[PDB]
Design a protein around this ligand. Sequence first.
Ligand SMILES: N[C@]12C[C@H]3C[C@H](C[C@H](C3)C1)C2
Lengths: 55, 55, 55
Amino acid sequence: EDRDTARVLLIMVRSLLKIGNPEDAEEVVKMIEELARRTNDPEIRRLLEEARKLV
Amino acid sequence: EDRDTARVLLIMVRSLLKIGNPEDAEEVVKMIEELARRTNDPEIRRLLEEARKLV
Amino acid sequence: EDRDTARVLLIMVRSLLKIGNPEDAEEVVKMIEELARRTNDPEIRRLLEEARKLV
Ligand SMILES: N[C@]12C[C@H]3C[C@H](C[C@H](C3)C1)C2
């Protein structure tokens, strides 16, 4: 499920920031963004914005 | 491949508990439950059970 | 995408080494190996060698 992959990637973003690695978190944000592009899901869009906001 | 996904998610569950985020770990258990429900693989079911036990 | 998956796994290798679970880090390298063998994608093999160097 596309939405499920996006929620796992958001959790990765949060954890990567917690261990002081925003450069890896930002790499994952890019994947959520391409997920939001391929689909048209406003939930995946919401997760992308939350991810960008944490980063 | 579905079994490798289950293994990756289990490692995430373990890692998230290690860094003190059981709420995110539980969310990853839910992702393994969705995987187990669309597959029916005895090893995926075994990985889901041992993730459940960490939580 | 398989390349996105390999990037996610490399990030997991680095993060797992950072939190002190080299054994899980090595398991994820194994998954990159599986991915590298199924695909023979040259970028996935590059990411594999990057992961191996960290371990
Ligand atoms: N497709 C994915 C499988 C596994 C869980 C999550 C993050 C990574 C590893 C890629 C989705």
